[PDB]
Structures are given as C-alpha cells and as structure tokens.
Design a protein around this ligand. Structure first.
Ligand SMILES: NC(=O)c1ccc[n+]([C@@H]2O[C@H](COP(=O)([O-])OP(=O)(O)OC[C@H]3O[C@@H](n4cnc5c(N)ncnc54)[C@H](OP(=O)(O)O)[C@@H]3O)[C@@H](O)[C@H]2O)c1
Ligand SMILES: NC(=O)c1ccc[n+]([C@@H]2O[C@H](COP(=O)([O-])OP(=O)(O)OC[C@H]3O[C@@H](n4cnc5c(N)ncnc54)[C@H](OP(=O)(O)O)[C@@H]3O)[C@@H](O)[C@H]2O)c1
Ligand SMILES: NC(=O)c1ccc[n+]([C@@H]2O[C@H](COP(=O)([O-])OP(=O)(O)OC[C@H]3O[C@@H](n4cnc5c(N)ncnc54)[C@H](OP(=O)(O)O)[C@@H]3O)[C@@H](O)[C@H]2O)c1
Ligand SMILES: NC(=O)c1ccc[n+]([C@@H]2O[C@H](COP(=O)([O-])OP(=O)(O)OC[C@H]3O[C@@H](n4cnc5c(N)ncnc54)[C@H](OP(=O)(O)O)[C@@H]3O)[C@@H](O)[C@H]2O)c1
Lengths: 259, 259, 259, 259
C-alpha cells in the first residue's frame, strides 16, 4: 500500500527513516507522500502532531503510526529497536484501526475552521482576557483570567493536564474546557471546575471589549484580529491509528506519568 | 398511575405533600408506595437521594421527580409554587423520560454491591490510607492520602467538584475518580489528575496493609472490615426522570454555582 | 503639607479630585506633584498601582492613600462619600503610617531593576517556557510550563491567588513563587506547590535554551531580549500608607472575596 | 552532657542505637531519658515526631537530632552511615542550635492545649463538617467541607502540601490554614486559598450545629465532644535542633520532592 514517513530531522530519526524505506523496499509498498494510506511519524509527539496536520484533509483515508526516538510518546507507540518488526507487520496488513475524537474550532470575524488533535487555546493579545462563555446558546459565565483551553480526549494528558483537567479515555466522544488563572471574587465569578462536553454541544466564546486574541491549535499559534466568535465542538472527523498490539490508554498514562 | 411522595419532614414539605395528594385525588392517580410508577421527592437533593435508595430495586419501573423546598437542587427540578402545575401535568401523562448513569460498587471480603447516584468514596478507618489502584486488571498506581472518590456524571457537581473533579454532562456514560489529599514525593507517586472512565472499565482498589475501610455510597457510610477488593464500574442500571420542560444540565450548573 | 491627587480620569474621579483640592484649599496644604508627601489615588487598585510607580523614587518620603470609585480595592481604602472626612483628617495630621513589603526584580543581560507592589511574572516570548530555578545559588528545579509569578504579601490577593497561591498577611516580610501550568511527568518535575521566601533569600531564574522573556512588573509588561538572569528578592524598600482607622487585612479579604 | 536515644524499634534502628550508646561511652556523655539535653531520634520523621512529644515539657532545655533509617526525613537530618561521625561531633560540643516555630492549639469545652510540630487538623465525627472561622475576633467565613488544617512552617511539606498549601521557610514565624474539600456554590462560600498568619493572630473555629470533632495534633488524633471553640496561634515555644553542618531547608525540599 501507499505510505510515507516524516522525520523529526535529527540524525537518529532520518537514519531510522531510511532503514524503514529500505525495509519497505522488499514488499508491495509504494512510497507516496501525496496520497499515502499509512503515515509513519518518527520523532516525538510533536513530530506526530505535524504529520497529522500535514494530512488532515485525508484523515478518512489514512492510518497513522508513530515511533518515538526520545522519550515515550502518547501518539508515538513504538520504539526504534522495533522498527523492523513494524515494517514486517505493516506490509503484511496484520493491523486493526482505532479512532480518537478530534476538536473542531471555528473562528468567525470571515470564518476560519481548524482541527485539533490535542487542544485549542485562547488568550488575549496582551491586555486583560475577558470573554463571555455561551453553551448551546445559553450564557454560562463571564470569564476573566489568562485564557481557556479546550482539549480532546487524547489531549487531556497534555496542556489540559497542567491546567488541572481530568484525563479522559479516548473512547469517550467529548471535549474538556479548562481555565487558565481565573479571577474569582465578590463581583467576578467563573465555574472554576473543568467542564466535559458531549458530542453536539457547542461552546462559544464571545468578546466583551477587546476583539484581538492569540489562538492556538496544537502547535500552531496565530494572532486573530477583529474576532466575533470562537466556536468549539467535537468534530465529526476522527484520526485513525494502525494498531498492531495491545497498548491500553491507561497503560500509556501509567508509563508516562507514574513510571 | 401509581405514585408516592416522600417529604423532607419539615412543616413546609409535609403540607406541600398533602396538597399534592389532595390534588392527585381529582385524577386517575392511585397513591402506592410499594409499587409506585412515579416517585415525587419534596425537600432537597438529600431527600431525593433517599427516595432513589428507597426504590432502587425498581429503577426500571419508576420515573423520579423532585421539588426543592429550600435552595435549588440538581435533582429537585421544581419550586413549591409550581406544585399544582406539576400535579396537572403528571396526571395528564404529558412527560418525557430522561436517564442518568449510575455507579456500581462491589465490596469483596463475602460480597456486597451498592448503587450510587452521586458517588462512592473510600477512606481508612483512622490510620493511614494506602491502596493499590488496578484499572482493567493492570496495576496503575499505589495511592497514599486521605481517600478516593468515584463519581457518576450527575454526581460531578457534588463531592467530586470539591475535590477538583470536572463537571460532566450526564449524557456521558462514565465515572470519574478523584484524589483526596494525595501524598506525592520522591518515592510516592499518584497521577494527581481526575480520571474519567467509560462504560465497561473496572477500577479495583486493593488493600496494601490495613484491610478496614470507611466506604460511603451517597449518604450511606459504613465501616467495612476485612476487605479484599472494592470494584467500581458504570452500572447497567439507570435512573429515570419525568421531564416536563427544558432545564438543561448546564443551566442547572449556572443557576447553582454562578447565579 | 505637600500633596497631589491622581485620578482614574473618568468623570466621577476628576470631580471628586477637584472637590478634594478645593477642600484642601481651606487648610495649610500645598498641591505639589513633584515632591509630594501625601499621594492620593482616586479610582481603582490599577490607579493606585500607577501612583505608586509614578513616585517610586521617593517611597521613603510619601504616605499613600487610595479612594475606590468603583468596587472596593485592596489599596484604595476609602469610599467617595468619605472624601470630605478624609480631607479633614489628612490636614489635621491625625494619621498613623503602615508599611507593606515590596519585591525587587533584577534583570541581567546590562542590568535593569524594578520594584513591584503586586508581583513580577515571567513568560516566554511565544515558544516553550523553560528555566532553571536557583535558590540561594542552589539549583532547585528545571521549570517547564507557561510561566512563574513572584508576589509580595499584598500581591497575594491578585494574580498569585488565581494561580493557587496562599494569601499572606502583609506584616510578613516575604515573597511567594507560584507556577503557571507546570508540566510534570516521568522526566519533567517541578515542586508544584507555591513557595514562600523570607527576606534575604534570592530566587534566580536562568534560561535553558531561549533567552527572550516577557516580564511583567505589576501593570508594566516588556519583552526582554538576551536575558542571562532574573533575580527576585524582598526589597529593602517599603510602601507607606496613611492610615486613619482600623481596616484589617483579613477584613479587606473578607469584604473582597466572601461578601 | 545528658542525652537519650529513641528508636523506631526495628532491628536496624535498635542496633544503630546500641552502637551510638557504646560510642558515647567513650566521652563525658551520660545517658538520661528523664532530663536529657540532647534527644537523638533514629527512624523516620514519625519517630522524630514522637520524640518531640515525649519531651515537649522541656523544649527549652533540649536540642533534637534525627537519623533516618529509611528514606530521608525533613527532621531526621542524618544517615545511618554517619552515626559515628555524629557521636564524635556531639561529644565535642561543635554544634549550633536552630529553632523552628510551633503551633499552639487550644480546645475549649474545660480547656485542653496542645503543641504541634507539623499541624493540627479538624474534621467532623462523621456527619457534615460546618464551622465558623473567626480571625482576631472578626467573623471571616462559614466553612463547609471535610475539614481544616493548620500547619507550622516545617509542617508545610507534610499534610499542608497535599492540601495545596504553600511551602514556607521555617525562619518565618507563621501558621498556614488550608481547606479540605470545601463546598462552594451560590449560597456557601469559602476563601478557597490557603491563609498564612503571622505571630499573634488568633484563628478560632466555632461550631455551627454539631459540637463533636475529630482533632489531630501531628500523629495524635482524638474525638473531642461538646466543643465550644478551637483556637490556633503561633506558639511562643520553639523546637531547638543541634546542627552540625549546612543543610538548607530548600535543599531538603529539593532532595525530598524533586530528586
Ligand atoms: N503548559 C503546558 O503543559 C503546555 C503548554 C503549551 C503547549 N503544550 C503542549 O504542546 C503541544 C504542542 O507543542 P509541540 O508538541 O509542538 O511542542 P512543545 O511545546 O515542545 O511540546 C510540549 C510537550 O508536550 C508533549 N505532548 C504532545 N502531545 C501530548 C499528549 N497528547 N499528551 C502528553 N504530552 C504530549 C510533547 O512530547 P514530545 O516531546 O514527544 O514532542 C512535548 O514534550 C500542545 O498540543 C500542548 O498540549 C503544553
Ligand atoms: N465535601 C463535600 O463537598 C461533600 C462531603 C460529603 C458529602 N457530600 C455530598 O453529600 C451527599 C450525601 O449527603 P446528603 O446530601 O444526604 O447530606 P449533606 O452532606 O448535608 O449534603 C451535602 C450537600 O450536597 C448537596 N448535593 C447533593 N447532591 C448534589 C449534587 N448532585 N450536586 C450538587 N450538590 C448536591 C445537597 O443539597 P441539599 O441541601 O438540597 O440536600 C447538600 O446541600 C454525597 O452524595 C456528596 O456528594 C459533599
Ligand atoms: N489572572 C489574573 O488574576 C491576573 C492576570 C494579570 C494581571 N492581574 C493583576 O493585574 C495587576 C495589574 O493590572 P492592572 O490592575 O493595571 O489592570 P487589570 O489587569 O485590569 O487589573 C486586574 C484586576 O486586579 C485588581 N487588583 C489589583 N491589585 C490587586 C490586589 N493587590 N489584590 C486584588 N486585586 C487586585 C484590580 O482592581 P481594580 O479594578 O480596582 O483596578 C483589577 O480589577 C497585576 O498586578 C496582577 O495582580 C491579574
Ligand atoms: N494526606 C497526607 O498527606 C497526610 C495525612 C495524614 C497525616 N499526614 C502526616 O502524618 C503526620 C503524622 O503521622 P506519622 O508521621 O506519625 O505517620 P504516617 O501517617 O505514616 O506519616 C505520613 C508521612 O509523612 C512524613 N512526614 C512527617 N513529617 C513530615 C514533614 N514535616 N514533611 C514531610 N513529610 C513528613 C512521614 O515520614 P516518615 O516515613 O519518615 O515517618 C511519613 O512518611 C502528620 O503530622 C501529617 O503531616 C499526612
């Protein structure tokens, strides 16, 4: 089948990449980075995040696999020493697919949409951050603070976790909203707690005074000017992984945070 | 249809109860507190929790309704001044049913099972609290601290919230595990974060030294001796509510915590 | 004595300012905004913070007073309706002085020093934030995350509080370091907890890769390039307040956050 | 000088104890566990806490030293392999004394007072926990939740830390109040944040309905019945340590929590 390999770009990763291409040379596997069916990422979770965004127009046609050159990754499921075993399994087609939910972000000004695998965040462009938070058209809170983070399930181990969010098993189709440094006093009030939203709920952020926001989607971060609305919902699209063995989410969590 | 009414037992609640019984007297509604089809709770969420546990052997046959005499409740959806309107709607059958997930607790010694609408918690019987946390038979962490709290979705606004858990929309079939005062240092390590579990995941707590635990299920709290295992999973059973109008979960959250 | 009055600049504040100047006209009080001995701030705590930084070269010669036009302030101790009573008390000299500790920030490149009344914070200029935290020349932790906040005692009710810091009575000569969204996992480790430092302890932040930082001192926020060190210590300088009645810190905290 | 040695009571600790007694036999050092001037604890910080409470009537006459048999301790400053070096230094009198602040607890019914080296905590005897918190005779908050923890500076690394309190350098004469699982909503309000109190401030807890409380002082935990008041203040008494080398507090914190 058609495949391609992205590399973190250090010496370790490029050579492991060349090795796998040579190894794939011995099977009915065609290198194709335009219309690949398998996308192998070699590096860290940052490398995997870039591979996902490189091909996010064909998530329906692609199964992703990650090899972590440094520490273990939540998306890069494989060690370098296992590359040859992976080459053989992929060529023989002995793999199941699994899917993770994704987050849709819409920015209205006159409208851009993004897909996130980890999260989308909103901060001010320097001044104070104040937004109205509207859940399914109902005004829920006026948020004052440093910013807001909306995480997918697999994103819950990343920025969301540092903000006090829960870790959510990726079989749950949800998104999680966490606060960054909310102001709470006599007059200003936020919920405080993380909020977990099911599919089809729409969280809308609406400016109060300033209309300029620094918006991040995974690694990408852009200053958006004259914003009327930021809309969050669980995407209809999903990322697909090639899975060759059992590696449960909670085992990845244990291995990454406990030992 | 058959119905019964429990009362918080103060003067306000009993009289509102008597009024509704008189009001039901004018329809084809039979008072029956053995095999009721509708269970009306008048009081607070504590009163509603007691009504649920009174009839938890027939959750399949019952739709619950709550009237809050004091502050607004998350389960008691109705104000006293609306009692007469409620009498009329219930008698005419103009109601939809909605369901919330419940938590199953199994205590093995030689085995008791409980159903919780808010949460189940585990603490020691005085000494230090140490348990091994096993997720789907995989050892996840050795927890040291004051205790652990496993919450249903509708429970996430209660004890779970005070422990830093996320609020979860009740359409999500999940349970959430939060830490009470975990010890984390060079040698002792817990995840820290709340954990959200889908249906069919089994969280097992296993003693390390002491085998005596104070276990709570909603309001009930019992000292269990010589415990071998505490098992948590999302129940196959659900609570059913009679719904007569739109009152979204996030609106209940806003009304209860924001204003 | 010599005095001056700064105003938030809205209609309410300017007119209250003009009234007090007219009122001071009836005593031996000379308006002087170059070498004032009393500095009256009329507005909010933001207005007071600007008054403090306007005159921070003569904190030894000045007693500050604040009038809050909007909500109650932690530094603006007086309501508008009390302005005339304040005019009379100040002119008669019936006031005690009280002092709050201040934070000294040194940025080395080739060295700038700042004084903060609330706090100094450090964030990256966009990329990831990584710094080594050195306490009294001893390497304490490698911090990864969004940033760090060093608060005075009276600052503990502001940004520090939103970050989970403790509130500290201003009679304690200390500074408090809080984390913004620290990354903690198998490999990366921060203390997590706020840290409270006595006088004469020196906390030094040292770059790891990137040398560009966005540094804030109270309201001021500046991009510093090619930074070698950020040094925090409790200042030898203190702010002095004119006090005319009992208004305990914990009462200000109660009034501002509880009711 | 007069000295005594307490032991954790395992084989390692008793034998290390016997060795030091034999070693002390070669100097002008008299074993005396009634009126000792030096108290050596061999075990963990729990062993040291028991030694402190054994002799808390003569804290003015005693310098404490701790040897940790297991992991490093915050009070047990010495490893077993260094016992002989310690014997020699103590006998030669080559030691400085350092002092840590202590917490005074008064329980009024008709009045008991306790001294804590780590902290004092208050919980209910089973039902809900509700107390009024009075700071220097001013009503500050009505606390609802699981309990409250008042920590000394050296206690801030223990229970206080697990509750989200700040770590405080022990040269600061203060106590820190942290919340256990506070309920915060539309009607119920607590400060949330830890509170740091200077010397001479008096925090008083006063019952609201129930008068029975489980009160802990370091390891001791007792059910107090018919309580009228719990009073917290920084003690006039201090613990004195024999110090033979530099081991800064922040280095102990680094070694215990970072690596
Ligand atoms: N305060 C924070 O915790 C914080 C702040 C900003 C951004 N981030 C994370 O950074 C991501 C994008 O940046 P980047 O990765 O391109 O560069 P980066 O900022 O250097 O990456 C931050 C770290 O997050 C790790 N990571 C990525 N996805 C993760 C996941 N799902 N669970 C746990 N850890 C994960 C990455 O692992 P590798 O080393 O294997 O790449 C990397 O070490 C965002 O999606 C966000 O989640 C975290
Ligand atoms: N630290 C804590 O936050 C804490 C500690 C222990 C127990 N609890 C809660 O108490 C419950 C059982 O006690 P109880 O109600 O019989 O007596 P209780 O301890 O007096 O009740 C505690 C309060 O929780 C409220 N509550 C109940 N269910 C709730 C929900 N789903 N979301 C938000 N608030 C809710 C009750 O409202 P009403 O006043 O209307 O009854 C009551 O005010 C447990 O299920 C637990 O969630 C909370
Ligand atoms: N996430 C946060 O909580 C956050 C983030 C950034 C900055 N800030 C605060 O903003 C300050 C400087 O900004 P600014 O005041 O010029 O404009 P600002 O960002 O609009 O001010 C933020 C708010 O903090 C209040 N405040 C100031 N000093 C305080 C104190 N000691 N305790 C409690 N609240 C206090 C101000 O009261 P007034 O309305 O009376 O002016 C204002 O409402 C910083 O010193 C920092 O503490 C807070
Ligand atoms: N949730 C919690 O974190 C929690 C709950 C209850 C009690 N405690 C602590 O337990 C103490 C009394 O119990 P115990 O020690 O007799 O038995 P314990 O409950 O078994 O001791 C708990 C642990 O705390 C450690 N510790 C003691 N003082 C400390 C300090 N100042 N800083 C950091 N760690 C410290 C002890 O070290 P060693 O192993 O060397 O003895 C022990 O490992 C209390 O003073 C309280 O601070 C903690």
């Amino acid at each position: 089948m058609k495949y391609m390999i992205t590399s973190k770009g250090d010496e370790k990763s490029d050579l492991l990449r060349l090795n796998m291409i040579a190894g794939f040379g011995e099977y009915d596997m065609e290198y194709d980075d335009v219309e690949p069916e398998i996308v192998i990422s070699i590096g860290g979770d940052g490398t995997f995040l870039s591979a996902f965004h490189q091909y996010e127009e064909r998530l329906d046609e692609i199964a992703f696999i990650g090899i972590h050159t440094g520490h273990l990754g939540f998306y890069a499921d494989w060690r370098p020493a296992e590359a040859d075993k992976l080459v053989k399994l992929l060529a023989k087609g002995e793999y199941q697919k699994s899917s993770y939910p994704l987050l849709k972000t819409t920015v209205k000004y006159k409208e851009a949409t993004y897909l996130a695998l980890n999260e989308s965040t909103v901060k001010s462009s320097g001044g104070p951050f104040v937004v109205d938070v509207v859940i399914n058209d109902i005004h829920f809170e006026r948020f004052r603070g440093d910013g807001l983070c909306m995480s997918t399930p697999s994103g819950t181990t990343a920025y969301n976790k540092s903000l006090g969010g829960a870790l959510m098993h990726p079989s749950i189709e949800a998104m999680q909203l966490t606060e960054m440094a909310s102001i709470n006093n006599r007059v200003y009030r936020t919920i405080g707690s993380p909020l977990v939203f099911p599919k089809h709920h729409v969280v809308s952020l609406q400016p109060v005074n300033d209309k300029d926001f620094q918006i991040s989607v995974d690694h990408l971060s852009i200053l958006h000017r004259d914003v009327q609305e930021i809309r969050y919902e669980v995407s209809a699209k999903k990322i697909h992984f090639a899975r060759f063995r059992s590696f449960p989410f909670w085992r990845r969590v244990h291995d990454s945070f406990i030992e």
